Write a protein that binds this ligand. Structure first.
Ligand code: A1CVQ
Length: 299
C-alpha cells in the first residue's frame, strides 16, 4: 500500500511552483526544483522549507543529487545553460555547465562523469574538468526518438542513446535496437542484464526480445534502490509532463503490481535511499500552476 503521510506546497507563494523532486543523501530532506528555477530543500515530514538556491531563470525539469551528497545536476526548460552541475559542500556553487543539453544524468557505478542529451545526441563530460570527452551519434543507426534521454548502464561500460547501445571505451555503436515507437528511447535495468525500451524488454547478451509490456508505453520509469519495484508514468502526448496515473511493476518479472490514479496531473516522482517513501509532485489545479508534494509511506 501507499499510506499518505504528508503534503506541502512552496512556502509563502500565492501559487506553488514545485516541478521536480529528489531525496537528498540526508534522510528526511527532499530537494525540489521550481517553475522559476529555484532549488529548495524541504523537511518532507514537517513540510517546512529549510533552504533555497537560485539555479536557473526558467523552470527546473530534472534534478539528480550525487550519492555522496557533494554534487547536484539540474536541467531547465528554456535557460542558457540548459543544465548544470552544482557543488553542495560549504558553499552552493556552480561547478560546470552543459549549455545545450536539456537532460543530464551521472554515471552510475563511479559518479565521475555526466551524460547529457541534446535531441538524439549524447555528450559525456568529466566532472572534475567539465570537458566534453565524447559525442555519441551514428547517422546510420539513429532511431530519431522524439523524447530521447541518454543513460549509462550500471557498470558505466555501456551507454544507451536513441535506442543505440554504445561501448564507451571504444566510443563505437555495438547494436541498434529496432524502433517500435516514436518517442521513448529506453533505460537499463539495474540488474545489468536487460534493456527496457518502451514496451520492449531486450536481453543485453543475445539482443533477443524477452518480453513485451504494453502498459509501459510512453512511460518514464524509475526503480527503487533495491531494484525490486519499477514505477512508470505515461507522458502526455508549463504543462504537466505526465497524466494523472502512475503504475508499479515487479522489477524481477515485469508483472504489474498496482495502477495508482491520483486524479491530478503528475509533475514528478522519486523514492528515498531506504525505499521507505515515495514523493510525488501533483498539480492541484489544471493547465493554474499550484503544485503540492505528496509523501507516501511505501508499505
Ligand atoms: N528523473 C526522474 C523521474 C522521472 N521524471 C521525469 O522523467 C520527468 C519529470 N519532469 C520531466 C519534465 C518536465 C518538463 O519538461 N516540464 C515541467 C516543468 C515546466 C516545463 C516542462 C520529466 C521528463 C519528461 C520526459 C523526458 Cl524524455 C525526460 C524527463 F526527465 C519519473 C519517472 C517515473 C515516473 F512515474 C514519474 Cl511521474 C517521473
Amino acid at each position: 500500500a501507499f499510506r499518505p503521510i504528508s503534503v506541502f506546497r512552496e512556502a509563502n507563494e500565492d501559487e506553488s511552483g514545485f516541478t521536480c523532486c529528489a531525496f537528498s543523501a540526508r534522510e528526511r530532506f527532499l530537494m525540489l526544483g521550481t517553475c522559476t528555477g529555484q532549488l529548495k530543500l524541504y523537511n518532507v515530514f514537517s513540510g517546512q522549507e529549510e533552504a533555497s538556491y537560485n539555479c536557473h531563470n526558467s523552470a527546473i525539469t530534472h534534478l539528480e543529487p550525487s550519492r555522496d551528497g557533494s554534487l547536484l545536476l539540474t536541467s531547465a526548460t528554456w535557460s542558457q545553460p540548459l543544465s548544470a552541475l552544482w557543488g553542495m559542500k560549504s558553499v552552493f556553487d556552480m561547478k560546470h555547465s552543459f549549455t545545450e543539453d536539456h537532460y543530464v544524468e551521472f554515471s552510475k557505478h563511479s559518479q565521475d562523469r555526466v551524460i547529457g542529451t541534446k535531441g538524439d545526441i549524447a555528450h559525456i563530460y568529466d566532472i572534475q574538468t567539465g570537458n566534453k570527452l565524447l559525442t555519441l551519434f551514428n547517422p546510420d543507426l539513429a532511431n530519431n526518438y522524439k523524447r530521447n534521454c541518454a543513460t549509462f548502464n550500471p557498470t558505466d561500460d555501456l551507454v544507451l542513446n536513441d535506442g543505440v547501445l554504445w561501448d564507451v571505451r571504444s566510443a563505437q555503436a555495438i547494436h541498434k535496437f529496432d524502433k517500435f515507437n516514436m518517442n521513448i528511447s529506453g533505460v537499463f535495468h539495474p540488474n545489468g542484464l536487460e534493456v527496457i525500451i518502451n514496451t520492449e524488454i531486450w536481453d543485453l547478451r543475445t539482443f533477443h526480445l524477452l518480453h513485451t509490456v504494453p502498459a509501459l508505453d510512453q512511460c518514464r520509469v524509475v526503480f527503487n534502490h533495491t531494484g525490486t519495484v519499477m514505477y512508470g508514468a505515461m507522458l502526455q502526448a508549463m504543462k504537466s509532463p505526465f497524466g494523472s496515473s502512475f503504475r508499479t511493476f515487479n522489477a524481477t518479472d515485469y508483472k504489474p503490481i498496482a495502477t495508482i490514479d491520483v486524479k491530478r496531473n503528475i509533475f514528478d516522482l522519486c523514492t528515498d535511499t531506504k525505499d521507505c517513501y515515495l514523493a510525488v509532485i501533483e498539480n492541484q489545479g489544471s493547465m493554474n500552476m499550484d503544485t503540492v508534494c505528496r509523501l507516501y509511506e511505501v508499505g
